[PDB]
Design a protein around this nucleic acid. Structure first.
Lengths: 100, 88, 51, 117, 55
RNA sequence: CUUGAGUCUCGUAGAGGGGGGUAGAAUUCCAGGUGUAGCGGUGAAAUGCGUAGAGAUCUGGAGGAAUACCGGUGGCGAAGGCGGCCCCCUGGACGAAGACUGACGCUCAGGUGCGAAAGCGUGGGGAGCAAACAGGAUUAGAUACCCUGGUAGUCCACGCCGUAAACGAUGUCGACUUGGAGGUUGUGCCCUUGAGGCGUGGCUUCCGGAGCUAACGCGUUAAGUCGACCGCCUGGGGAGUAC
């Protein structure tokens, strides 16, 4: 498989869904013969610019390792989900853990 | 390019011994794979020329090797062209 | 570019931001573009910067 | 007769002319000036000391309220990016923040070929 | 440096305009300059850092 | 047989290519608020736009093209060319311990393929720019330069056309031959205590010695000393024209 690192920022007034969103994704990854060696909840915070309006959003990281196939399934559930304002996921670059 | 679990795999199928990544029988066969595999890639995109240049490279480069075998051991040639379904 | 100071006075601080953009990358546009004229004059003016 | 108290002032600094409008906080026109309308026209304007007399004319149309303080919005290059702010500092107005709102793209549209003599 | 979360060690390589500081006044071994800029770009999407300044 | 050439391993840098996403700045336009007699343009002017309310300003929306800064005397590519961030498919280059094959190589008429821009066909798209065209100005005249507009086109797909000062105006491959300063990227090593210091490869700038050259100049990336193969020249015009 190939490592990853996805940081999704969900709408500020939908934070309560963030915790639930994590379980789904995480569960899938685990059920995809993958691994999760990084995780952190940044919560709400001011933005550089009012990206997609407002001036704050909920941040979360990841840095998985699951097979590209199953992660490509994420872009869909990510797009078709007004909760999440912006999506941004880079490639492997070898397992990343702690710090951040 | 090609995956190790495949490259280091095939080498142990045509090599007249062990870890003989040099052997024509090996190298040559190793070329067909990356070639056949790319044919599915070039089926898409098409306009991607800079990648075909390398494709053609390994193709002619493969032929340069086939001619050699014929000029070093007639048998080995016809004995390998089959295992690779070459000539077409 | 963002100024702001206590104690009313028209000192300046303004020409501080006048070193990153300002009337430069402005007139840079102004008229037409460049295309080949730059890649060339940009690589000739470089020769100047030698001595 | 509204008494905006404080409102930013846009300084459309251009070459062939310069104009400053003392708009309100939200961005409503309260009083605008103009070099072309400042006696001298043709092209005699432009020059800084010519725009200063223009924007200063606002303190005659926007003075009906009582602007006790105001910011400054300088846009575009030309002889009127400094002059304006100066004349305003003497007119009696205050100041809250100076800034350049000149439209600096990222290689978007392709500017006009133009000029070639 | 190869990231964007390290927003802490980036505000130094910019200015009141959030513009990527040149390598002239940095001499950041070049190879690093390349990486340093790449971060400031992608990092701006996560609103971690600003693009311009007027907005 | 192994040093040429190639394979394997593990790393490294890259605007190499094809596909799909996505972001921010700006322009234009549509709508509405504020506000009022100018705006725009030039050397001046005028056409043009303005009291049916422009310009300015602010809020919301639509759309297309290109990606400031980083950006460099930088990098990648056979050439043409290739700059936002992200993912997917993919090519080449280089270094190092090495392990492997064993001359499998160099060049290449004909042949096949790739080719800036402009142009062509079908269908899309169209913000800005702009051949044509139309006004205004300049002038002796002005079928121009300048100004106000503006259509093809520029953008996308797919197919065609094959040209360029397609330029290093310098064919590809290999071996030799004083030096100096620098750039970029790999690797070994050094109280690795450091920005760092010493080597050893790749690519690349500038100066320059011998030599070469008609001179300018080229000068280890040669236009120097040699070897292998290919393309080409034989006065100017007529003519890259006629058939």
């Amino acid at each position: 498989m190939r490592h990853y690192e996805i940081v999704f920022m969900v709408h500020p007034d939908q934070s309560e869904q963030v915790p639930g969103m994590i379980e789904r994704y995480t569960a899938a990854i685990t059920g995809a013969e993958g691994k999760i060696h990084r995780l952190e909840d940044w919560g709400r915070r001011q933005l550089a610019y009012p990206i997609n309006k407002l001036h704050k959003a909920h941040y979360v990281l990841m840095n998985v390792e699951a097979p590209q196939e199953v992660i490509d399934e994420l872009e869909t559930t990510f797009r078709f989900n007004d909760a999440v304002i912006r999506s941004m996921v880079m490639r492997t670059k070898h397992a990343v853990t702690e710090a951040s | 390019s090609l995956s190790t679990e495949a490259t280091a795999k095939i080498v142990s199928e045509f090599g007249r011994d062990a870890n003989d990544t040099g052997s024509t029988e090996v190298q040559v066969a190793l070329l067909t794979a990356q070639i056949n595999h790319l044919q599915g890639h070039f089926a898409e995109h098409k306009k991607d020329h800079h990648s075909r240049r390398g494709l053609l490279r390994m193709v002619s480069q493969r032929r340069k090797l086939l001619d050699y075998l014929k000029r070093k051991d007639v048998a080995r040639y016809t004995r390998l062209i089959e295992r690779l379904g070459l000539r077409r | 570019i963002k100024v702001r100071e206590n104690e009313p006075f028209d000192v300046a601080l303004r020409r501080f931001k006048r070193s990153c953009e300002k009337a430069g990358v402005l007139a840079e546009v102004r008229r037409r573009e460049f295309y080949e004229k730059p890649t060339t004059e940009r690589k000739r003016a470089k020769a100047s910067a030698v001595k | 007769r509204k008494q905006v108290s404080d409102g930013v002032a846009h300084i459309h600094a251009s070459f062939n002319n310069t104009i400053v409008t003392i708009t309100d906080r939200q961005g409503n026109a309260l009083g605008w000036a103009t070099a072309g309308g400042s006696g001298f026209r043709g092209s005699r304007k432009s020059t800084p000391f010519a725009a200063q007399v223009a924007a200063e004319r606002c303190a005659d149309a926007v003075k009906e309220y009582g602007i006790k303080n105001l910011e400054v919005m300088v846009k575009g290059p030309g002889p009127g990016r400094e002059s304006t702010i100066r004349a305003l500092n003497a007119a009696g107005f205050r100041i809250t923040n100076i800034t350049d709102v000149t439209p600096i793209p990222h290689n978007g549209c392709r500017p006009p070929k133009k000029r070639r003599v | 440096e190869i990231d964007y979360k390290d927003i802490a060690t980036l505000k130094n390589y910019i200015t009141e305009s959030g513009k990527i500081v040149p390598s002239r006044i940095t001499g950041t071994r070049a190879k690093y300059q390349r990486q340093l800029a790449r971060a400031i770009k992608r990092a701006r999407y996560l609103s971690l850092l600003p693009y311009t300044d007027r907005h």
